[PDB]
């Protein structure tokens, strides 16, 4: 058993011990553990997935170096890896399609078991590790959540975007997720027009820096999108905020058949106008995290120079805890 | 110009004149004009699509006999036909995919121009007419809306149903639409379990008569569906009511990745729990009417004996105005 | 190490030893090992997948009883199970979507490692075992290949079938696979018309017994299908034979946009008329085996009485070796 | 009736008369009529679609200026337009989904009725005309076939390409179609690797000029693609040639689940290895022309500067007849 310095969540406002790996398990030395809006919802005790219990080391957005292995892990000590965060039960019909992210008995380091705000972290199986060929664990850490979630959301969006020669895609909420959502869209789709929506001028400026073509307050978005699309509307809106008001307003900006990809869940509920949605065949599609292939893909885009990290190192854009 | 007895909507609480057909236009003698919840929303002035104006003959659910033709109509006088209700502008990118039903400049007899609560009715083009080979116009009339809408909704549902060997499909709201939605599902899908939800015991009994396997109040639906699916949840919920509360409650009954098909729009808004929807990749898909192929298909199912009409004839289930 | 009586393939025209399970491995007592056309191609040395080597116990279509377990198997001794046959490497992008069946480094009992024509058989992981709640291992054995392959093929077909109200589906080649393909189609799709094609009158009779609506020689199929579909053509052809001539002829029977699902590979090549295929947007879609969910699904259909086995017990339709 | 100078096909090795438009018909002054490999197959009497008869003015790839209109045409004299080439019967289930291109009773100017190698040309309906806002009819003419066909083929490919972060796409045959296929792919997809295959060094050089990343002889393609994809294979192969040998060889280069999009039909048949296709779930998808939206889209890409024409003007890359 290995000693490790961590940050513990004990009540909703130092040095721990970590078991040695057996079977397929792997022990890693954390290089980076990203800080999510999800950590703050757990921190504030407004979100608790199955198996959650106190205390717990938070941090579900993790990269580092392999230091010890069980006899069945089949991985190389010294390799840098990013940790896929949603460890499915492997048995259910979702896991049997690689949809570990929507397994209802998933184990999540930092959300339901000990995570990355710690020197060392146990990983249940090497099957959850994606190799970093050249990207640093610190820069790679956000890919384990913000990156993968952005990719999974974009993949749901693609058929809606590909229907048009010059589609407008709305990205609502410019924070950690928008870093990856905007850059991934521009990396893949050469003829897309991205519109960034936020209430903060600072955030709108940042969306432009990330690669948004236009930015807007929500109230001004219709007049802009009308002009950009000759009244057609947006192909997709990726909602990184997810409140009653964001989805309602986004839905109305969509062209017929268009979709909101719901990633954010800051509100208790989401809402849509019944007439606009039913009459024009509009859609809302929930998106939680992504597949192992999605994580592989964002690592590859990053290592090939197509995505740039915007990270803020924080000693124990996106913030990253190092160690 | 032809004289005709109709029922006029003049304020929101006899004998008219009808132009002779030119070009591709066709004049029909109405055999049946169905009565919709949509007529009551227009009647009460809570719904007005583009081009709507007073006065107007309502009735958008129409069948009858061809009596006169323009020189370009290319149809046979004496043929019985059902009238496709959503006459697209033919020019837009939705009409160019046969998606006339979601054209934003559609002309609709009974909703935006004169309809079927009348002895005779002008049809803008023969392209909107589907032949009845043996079904009577009176029995066929509901296919022009309830039938086609049910088919379009089911077609959106199919890939979600086909994922499972023994899927539960929820049908919420047991009225005119449920007549066709339940029967069409059972006509196509041999191994489906249909659960009918309504607050009325009478309506629940009627759902069983139509072919539902089980019926339930919404509050009891979770415990039933849990038992029927070993906790998996429903594959699809077809919402024929469409209020803030119906969608919210239906969403929770779905298995991961499952969808609500939103057909009804009795409420101003619909709503969903943000966590349940985002975390489990659930969906809401708007459905308005269907394609000409959908209308052809429900006519064929009806003529082959696979759907039975539940109609109530009303001299000027589903009510039908005759003439 | 456990003694076991098997049948060995030593050259291309008794009693062996079997290792005890470790880690996730499971040892089963074979109840049924089905005999495939694939075994005969391996037997004749005309087919050898990666890792194949002599000698080898054939038989990739297996069910039986759990008798011993490794410490990590997490399964119950005494349970009856069917063995999923395509053991993926778990690492590749296909396995990460549960597509173990198309993993290029798959291990297959009876095709690349020791299989089921043997009293006992080692299974690499309990993850490859699907529980039989009530079906006997002998009756269940064909589900491990013929059944699952039929299901996977049908699942590719579904969107092509669901486009129509009264689709004709062709099933070409009436042998072991047709047992499941025909019955599964009829179990799922209530309004389908199945046309069975074979050169053998005996086989055509058997297709009718299995649930085909019509049967035909290939040369007579066009005139029949024309009559059944008013010249539209077939929605799908499932080719269980797969020669140069079968695909060529089947392609021509399809409606525009229709597909051949290629399951059989009795020929070296398949072929299609370039004009008919390109001009009418026809398709050919390869299908190898299925997912773990596909196996689960055919087990459930069988246990619910919706599929009937046609098995021939053979002491060491479909033949089954017992033990 | 209007006099016009044309080129007539009379046997398989000057001045005509053209009727005045009625109803929805439009008369155009040809600005450009492109020359296709299809014209040469008709010219040589190796291809004749329904309704074809001698004599006939060839040329199905047409743009020009509106000069006269029937009373129902609803278009503006003086407007420049490109002519959609596949005039569906409007009645069938394919036309009811805007799939005019696969209507079996289509009328095609230059293939089944008089076409564009002529000063003036009658267009059956204004519904077949797409407006040119700024592109010249001469430069626009190839969009009416090569352009639209490329777009339709790419649209079938997209879901296969979008599955990967860095997909290789093969384009086989570098002629008129490749001009648009290569440029459209690069216009839409920023992270694609295009491999051009041809037997001609000249054509391979031209593929590089058009935007291919690599070029190869077919025999050398496997070793290249293996290196480019770490042995995965190509996501898609667009076959602009379409012979027994091209499809066979292309199929083998594909990753599991990958597809050939069959556009070319230079051979009588196409062929595929049965084992490679069935075992790895590979596909062949026929593609004929595209939708009206596809034509709109390539016009827009061209007018926005994202596609460049490679045209050769020929007084009566791609050749264009002017007038
Ligand atoms: Zn997070
Ligand atoms: Zn699971
Ligand atoms: Zn209605
Ligand atoms: Zn329209
Ligand atoms: Zn087999
Ligand atoms: Zn694999
Ligand atoms: Zn051409
Ligand atoms: Zn047609």
Nearest CB to D292: which of B23, B96, B296? B96
Same domain for A168 and A32: no
C286 CA distance to ligand 6 middle (Å): 18
**Domain coverage including residue C251:** 146-288
CA angle D53, D58, D63 (to 5 degrees): 135
Q: For B13-67, what is the HEC assignment?
A: CCEEEECCCCCCCEEEEEEEEECCHHHHHHHCCCCCCCCCCCCEECCCCEEEEEE
Same domain, B137 and B199: no
How many Å lie between the alpha carbon of B180 and the closest alpha carbon of chain C?
Answer: 14
Residue contact B293–D127, C-beta within 8 A: no
Which of B23, B97, B102 to mutate to probe the D interface, most D CBs <10 Å? B97
* Residue whose token pair is 């290995």: A2
Q: Are residues B140 and B160 in the same domain?
A: no
Comparing alpha-carbon positions, the chain C residue that sits nearest to D46 is C275
Contact indicator for C141, C63 with CB cutoff of 8 Å: yes
Count the Cβ atoms, other than its own, within 10 Å of residue D58: 27
Q: D313 and D198, same structural domain?
A: no
For residues D2 and D139, state if they share a domain.
Answer: yes
Beta bridge partners of A66: A28
Count of helix runs (H) and strand runs (E) in chain C: 9, 18
Looking at the complex, report in whole angstroms how far the Cα of residue C301 sits from the nearest Cα belonging to chain B.
7
Question: For residue D128, what is the DSSP state?
Answer: G
Q: Give DSSP secondary structure letters for D259-291.
A: EEEE----SSEEEEEHHHHHHTT-EEEE--S--
The answer to whether residue B191 neighbours chain C at the CB level (below 8 Å) is yes
Torsion sign across C-alpha atoms A80, A83, A84, A87: positive
**What contacts D73, CB < 8 A, 6 or more positions away?**
D21, D23, D24, D25, D26, D125, D126
Q: Is the omega angle on the peptide bond into residue A55 within 30 degrees of 0, that is, cis?
A: yes
Burial C292-323 (b: 16+ CB within 10 A, else e): bbbbbbbbbbbeeebbebbbeeeeeebbbbbb
Residue B94 Cα, gap to closest chain A Cα (Å):
8
Whether C202 and C303 map to the same domain: the answer is no
Tally of structural domains, chain D: 2
> Are D2 and D141 in a shared domain?
yes
Closest-CA residue of chain B to C304: B166
Spatial distance between the Cα atoms of B37 and A112, rounded to a whole number of angstroms: 48
Measured CA to CA in angstroms, residue D292 lies from B90, D146, D299 at distances of: 11, 14, 11
Distance C266 CA to ligand 5 centre (A): 12
CB proximity D268 to C under 8 Å = yes
CATH number for the domain harbouring residue D210: 3.40.50.720
b (16+ CB within 10 A) / e for B150-181: bbbbbbbbbebbbbbbbbbbbbbbbbbbbbbb
| Residue partners of B183: CB distance under 8 A and separation at least 6 | B210, B211, B306, B307, B308
**Which residue is listed with tokens 């005509």?**
D16
Using an 8 Å CB-CB cutoff, list chain A residues near D186: 190
B294 and chain C in contact, CB less than 8 A: no
Interface check D279 vs C, CB under 8 A: yes
**A155 contacts chain D (CB < 8 A):** yes
- Residues B114 and B170 occupy one common structural domain: no
Answer yes or no: are the C-beta atoms of A156 and A289 closer than 8 Å: no
Which ligand places an atom closest to the C-alpha of D103?
A: 8
CA distance C5 to chain B (A): 37
For C286, the closest of D265, D282, D286 (CB atoms) is D282
Nearest beta carbon to residue C281 from set D266, D273, D286: D286
Is the link from the previous residue into D55 a cis peptide, with omega within 30 of 0? yes
Contact status, residue C199 vs residue C217, Cβ threshold 8 Å: yes
> Could you identify the residue written with the tokens 């032809």?
B2
| CB proximity A166 to D under 8 Å | yes
- Identify all chain C residues contacting A72, using CB atoms and an 8 Å cutoff: 23
Residues less than 5 Å from ion ligand 2, measured at CB:
A 88-89, 92, 95, 103
Closest C-alpha among C285, B29, C40 to residue D281 = C285
Q: Residue C267 burial by CB count (10 A; 0-12/13-18/19+): exposed, middle or buried?
A: middle
DSSP state, residue D156: H
Chain C nearest CA to B49, separation (Å): 30
Taking the CA of D180 as reference, the closest ligand is 7
Interface residue D294 vs chain B (CB under 8 A): no
Contacts for A44 with CB less than 8 Å, ≥ 6 apart = A12
Cα separation, C142 vs C311, in Å, equals: 8
Q: ∠ CA A283-A289-A295 to the nearest 5 degrees?
A: 125
Distance CA(D39)–CA(C319), nearest Å, equals: 56
Distance from CA of C269 to the nearest CA of A (A): 31
Within 8 A by CB and 6+ apart from C220, the residues are none
Residue of chain B nearest C151, judged by CA positions: B165
Query: Which residues surround the ion ligand 7 when the cut-off is CB under 5 Å?
Result: D 36, 38, 145
Q: Which residue of D has its CA nearest to A164?
A: D297
Which of B23, B90, B291 is closest, CB to CB, to D97?
Answer: B291
Integer Cα distance of C11 and A162 in angstroms: 54
Q: Could you tell me how far CA A55 lies from the centroid of its own chain?
A: 24
**Touching check for C292 and chain A: CB below 8 Å?**
yes
Q: How far separated are the first and last CA of chain C, in Å rounded?
A: 19
A201 and A316 together in one domain: no
CATH at residue A300: 3.90.180.10
Contacts of D164 in chain A (CB under 8 A): 297
Q: Is D280 on the interface with C (CB under 8 A)?
A: yes
Say yes or no: C158 and C117 in one domain: no
Using the mean position of ligand 6's atoms as its centre, give its distance from the Cα of residue C91 in Å: 5
- Rounded to the nearest angstrom, the minimum Cα separation between A217 and chain B is 22
Rounded Cα gap, residues B305 and A251, in angstroms: 40
Tokens describing residue C85? 């046959």
Q: Please give the distance of CA B233 from its chain centroid, rounded to a whole number.
A: 26
Q: What are phi and psi of B235, to 5 degrees?
A: -75, -40
Residue A44 touches partner C, C-beta closer than 8 Å: no
Rg for chain C, CA atoms, rounded: 20
Which residues of chain D are within 8 Å of residue A162 when distances are taken between CB atoms? 155, 158, 162, 188
Nearest Cβ partner for B280 among A267, A277, A288: A288
Task: Give yes or no for a contact between A310 and A146, defined as CB atoms under 8 angstroms apart.
Answer: no
Q: Which ligand is nearest to the CA of A256?
A: 4
Q: Which of A96, A97, A125, A294 to mutate to test the interface with C (most CBs of C within 10 A)?
A: A96
Contact C90/D at CB under 8 A = no
D130 to chain B: closest CA residue: B91
DSSP B105: T
Q: Are residues C279 and C319 in the same domain?
A: no
The closest ligand to the CA of A97 turns out to be 2
Q: How far is the CA of B120 from the centre of ligand 7 (A)?
A: 47
CA–CA separation, B185 and B195 (whole Å): 12
Q: Indicate whether D9 and D112 sit together in one domain.
A: yes
Cβ partners under 8 Å of residue C91, min gap 6: A127
A89 annotated as belonging to a binding site for a ligand: yes
Residue D145: what are its φ and ψ, rounded to 5°? -140, -70
């Amino acid at each position: 058993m290995v000693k490790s310095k961590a940050a513990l969540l004990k009540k909703f406002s130092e040095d721990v011990n970590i078991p040695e790996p057996q079977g397929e398990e792997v022990l890693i030395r954390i290089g980076g553990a990203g800080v999510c809006r999800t950590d703050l919802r757990v921190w504030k005790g407004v979100e608790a997935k199955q198996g959650f219990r106190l205390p717990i080391i938070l941090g579900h957005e993790n990269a580092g170096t392999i230091v010890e292995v069980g006899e069945l892990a089949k991985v190389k000590k010294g390799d840098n890896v990013v940790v896929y965060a949603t460890w499915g039960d492997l048995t259910c019909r979702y896991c049997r399609e690689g949809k570990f992210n929507i397994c209802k008995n998933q184990i999540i380091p930092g959300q339901t078991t000990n995570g990355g705000f710690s020197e060392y972290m146990l990983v249940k199986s090497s099957r959850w590790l994606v190799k970093l060929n050249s990207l640093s664990p610190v820069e790679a850490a956000p890919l384990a959540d913000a990156g993968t979630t952005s990719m999974g959301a974009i993949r749901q969006a693609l058929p809606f975007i590909s229907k048009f020669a010059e589609p407008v895609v709305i990205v609502n909420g410019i924070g950690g997720l928008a870093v990856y959502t905007i850059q991934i869209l521009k990396a893949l789709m050469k003829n897309i027009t991205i519109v960034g929506i936020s209430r903060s001028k600072k955030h709108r400026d940042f969306a432009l820096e990330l690669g948004a073509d236009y930015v807007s307050e929500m109230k001004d978005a219709e007049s802009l999108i009308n002009k950009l699309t000759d009244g057609l509307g947006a192909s997709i809106a990726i909602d990184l905020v997810g409140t009653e008001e964001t989805t309602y307003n986004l839905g109305k900006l969509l062209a017929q058949e268009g979709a909101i990809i719901l990633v954010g869940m800051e509100g208790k509920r989401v809402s849509l106008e019944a007439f606009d949605t039913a009459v024009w065949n509009k859609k809302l599609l929930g998106s939680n995290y992504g597949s192992l292939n999605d994580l592989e893909d964002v690592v590859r885009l990053s290592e090939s120079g197509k995505i740039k990290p915007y990270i803020i190192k924080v000693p124990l854009g996106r913030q990253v805890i190092t160690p």
